[PDB]
């Protein structure tokens, strides 16, 4: 259960929770992690030798794959996963530091400590939402369509003439792309909802 515990900690939302981050956001995060693991291992796999171009010239396949796929889908997904996880790690380290300060004191102010923890948690949720939105926009920029292309025409050096060539598995890649963007959209919606509900609860407290 160490993997599940770590994944929960990546959306732990510490003490100040809205029953949205702990239940729904955590499960969506774990689901996205599992889908990304499956896709990266099996579907994309190597994604370099699986790209075949109808050429005898050495190096034309590499440059042709580079031109159309500057960064892989799985690479962006893993990078987004790491950057989304980082605010949660910041909050966990901050709460551990605060607990250590409390135990050092043991060996008004508590209200201020709780307020600071709440503020840092809210800021981290906002930053997570911003990272998700930015990566969604980056995916839109680099890969407009949700479907993976099947045929591409290449004329870049050192390819002598224009050559047509093929992506490995467009259908599975399209399915996993739809899954990943659906999970990202659900995460964005849940993050916005959690921010709004946190603000409402804070206003109700005052």
């Amino acid at each position: 259960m160490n993997s599940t515990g770590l994944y929960t900690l990546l959306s732990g939302v510490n003490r100040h929770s809205t029953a949205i981050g702990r239940v729904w956001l955590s499960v969506i995060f774990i689901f996205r992690i599992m889908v990304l693991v499956v896709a990266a291992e099996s579907v994309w796999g190597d994604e370099k030798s699986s790209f075949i171009c109808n050429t005898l010239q050495p190096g034309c396949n590499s440059v042709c794959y580079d031109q159309f796929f500057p960064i892989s889908h799985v690479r962006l997904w893993s990078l987004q996963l790491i950057l989304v996880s980082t605010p949660a790690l910041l909050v966990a380290m901050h709460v551990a530091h605060q607990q250590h300060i409390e135990k050092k004191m043991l060996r008004r102010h508590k209200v201020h400590i709780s307020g600071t923890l709440w503020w840092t948690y809210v800021i981290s949720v906002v930053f997570r939402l911003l990272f998700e939105a930015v990566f969604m926009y980056v995916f839109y920029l680099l890969y407009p369509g949700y479907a993976m292309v099947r045929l591409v025409k290449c004329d870049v050096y050192p390819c002598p003439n224009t050559v047509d060539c093929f992506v490995s598995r467009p259908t599975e890649k399209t399915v996993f792309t739809v899954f990943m963007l659906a999970a990202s959209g659900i995460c964005i919606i849940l993050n916005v909802a959690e921010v709004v509900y946190l603000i409402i609860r804070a206003c109700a407290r005052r």
Copy 2:
């Protein structure tokens, strides 16, 4: 025993149990997981280079394998495994949240809490059954026969003429397919039985 504990948690059915989910459904789930692991590692394996087509044209093998196998059997099985596991993760996170709320209160209403937990568990079981049925229908749509084909004729671009070519290991794939669909059918039957018995127990309580 961490793997067994996680697999049990993927069918933990929390406190409200009918002696069907904990004993039978859990073991069938673990058995399906083991069979899928063995099949994905060894039987399908790469399932890309193992596909050989009698062609010299580069890229014809890839498109021919794509046309007849849009999504692999193991890919669908893993996706179904994840989607079936997700309601159980939702229930586990919900019960953890409820326990944390209880401990926060510690640091009528309990009857309502138990009722909500029972309702969420029943809804999750129904959703799991729905996912299993949907994936069974998807397997029927994509792969009508239980047996794996041996020979396929291909004429798609860029293959110059029609070419006949072969799947890697039809017999082992057929055996593992039969195992997986049998496990899925048993899971569907057990889910329906658990739903019915839960409804009967609830009626008996009232």
Copy 3:
């Protein structure tokens, strides 16, 4: 020791033991697991590229390997291992459920509970013996001789003429086959002995 603990649980025989399942059957089970792991990793390994047939025709090697080896030895051994393990998982889940019912009651009947546990354990042992015997018969059907063949003649499509070709490592495969069937026979004998001794003990109790 987690692996050893899991393997013991796969022959845990819970509370009602005859000093045959816990000591001897568990060790034979673990020994068979280790031998299967070594064979699957190293000896059979890929067992697909290691099959070389004296042909230039693409796809003849695959169909020739399929005709003579419909299902691999290691595949059958792993499948038998899983199916033999499943009754033990059923018994472990059942005893966990019974313990949870006992603790729920805590938060004549006990004699009935012990009797039901004994009966389920006996039935599981019988089912394990049946699975072992069935897999032994399946091995006899598919692979009559204990020794692995060295040369096979192939004429199936698309091989143009009859071609002779070779298995990778007949001697190591034969040695590991003898080891595996010896372990299976010992397991069958021990299962029969445990059933008989359980019946004798039950009669002595009455």
Copy 4:
């Protein structure tokens, strides 16, 4: 959580902390570790066969890749990671030794012990900053530009004539290089800030 615990120990900063090393430096360190793992596994990968040079001469590809890439980016990153981690391991071992001496005594001086621990921690932070700066300078020396080159001309023996050839994935390598150098710069800034704040706190104590 063992991996997270180890990574935290690699920036544990023991008892004398400034709320910069525990919260921010630890998370930046873990983020750099994750980015390096992803890059080394997927982006660079083998980085030897992915280098293709337009030659038929055997051995020209190896020497050409050697001339332009004496040491890989991931190799330097891993070496820097190890050397940066080593002062933290020294401090952890020293504090464990001091605790063992304390427990041996159990089975003024304590003030001196705390002072020595503080001094060793400060020296270790300074050494970590020095290692980071040295590796940044080494990266500047070996790879001036942040962007990865795409085309290189090679004339070294045994290549018969000058040949142009290509790096595998310049864009992903450039992105991960920018990420790694940004993380290193943030680590350098945070180390300098922690040193300054430690000196200020020490002066305030006196």
Copy 5:
């Protein structure tokens, strides 16, 4: 420390110890395990493609490697490791069963229990020594010389004419072979010494 604990359990010698099995035999066993792991992973590695024979005939390399190397060195070493470990697993399971019987009784005879445990331990040590001696004799039979051959002449079917061909790394294989046989001889000597000292201690008790 789980691996070290398991390896110690593979020579645990339970309660009746002679300060030879626990200290010396355990360490020699672990050393042999580490050497075997290193050799199997790196030195022998695949040991199939590393065998190159000066032939164009397909299948001649496989049969030639089979004729001179019926079973690999690492295969025999792993098999010997498993068979040597099995008596220790029997003793561990027996002592666990005896402890469970003791706790069931809790929920003269003890002297008899200790005597039976001592006898089973002595018999297991004798069986371990017998297995070691048998495997040493098997290595002598299959591979007379300690040094690995470098050149072999092959004329078996389907090789058209006699062909000379080469083992991958004779020097490293020879070094690791010397290490493994030295460890096995030390284990044999220590097992004989432990048997003799156990008999002497038993006689001294009487």
Copy 6:
């Protein structure tokens, strides 16, 4: 932290410590382990296919690589690591045995026990230093220069004419070689210092 705990146990120096083995030697040992892991995985890697020789004759590459590299650098480093670790395992097993004897007695002499433990620890440190020095001399014998060669001339059978060929990555191999020998020299110096300081402390006690 299990890996760190095991590595510390490989230099645990048990109870009689000089604040050199626990703090400095342990960290240098772990650093050497990490550097060896990185080098073996990435830098040397396969180190067999990475060796390319300008020949068409099959088997000339293997014999040429064998002649100049009888045993790999990483192979010697791993063997040295194991042999250096073994005295520490002996001491750990001995102290565990002594603790078990103490607890069996529980269920003058203690001074003698402490003296024997001190003596065994000193002898183990001396043996570790001897192993390090012997492996340093072996590296000097087999590989005189610290730098890895780039070009080698080969004329051994079956190579028809003299052929020049190339090592994979001389610069990275040279860097990692310098790192490993520097770590080994530091270990030797620290072992000598620990022996001297232990003798001085023992003389001071008397």
